[PDB]
């Protein structure tokens, strides 16, 4: 704040001191998932990591 | 006391000692205040002593 020099009332204004706040959170689930028969797996699938885990 | 020599009245008036007392007090406050705001130390004062402390 400021003030006159030399004024006859002598009251200063407090300043105040007010910290904030927000918050972060956790909201979703991301993920993929795949099915396969018993038939698929036996026969279909010939190499896991390239066919299944890659994509 | 005195008293005649040879009179048959043989009493002796007997003196008396009496210590007296007075008090003294302590019962004033002699001052000298002064006021002055910080502009007037700031600007207006230029040697504490001669112009404050001595008078």
């Given at each position: 704040n400021r003030r006159d020099l030399r004024d006859p009332d002598r009251t200063v204004i407090a300043s105040e001191l007010v910290e904030h706040s927000f918050g972060v959170t956790l909201d979703k689930h991301v993920y993929a998932a795949l099915k396969f028969t018993d038939e698929q797996r036996t026969l279909?699938?010939?190499?896991y990591t390239k066919q299944v885990l890659m994509p």
């Open positions: 279909d699938i010939r190499d």
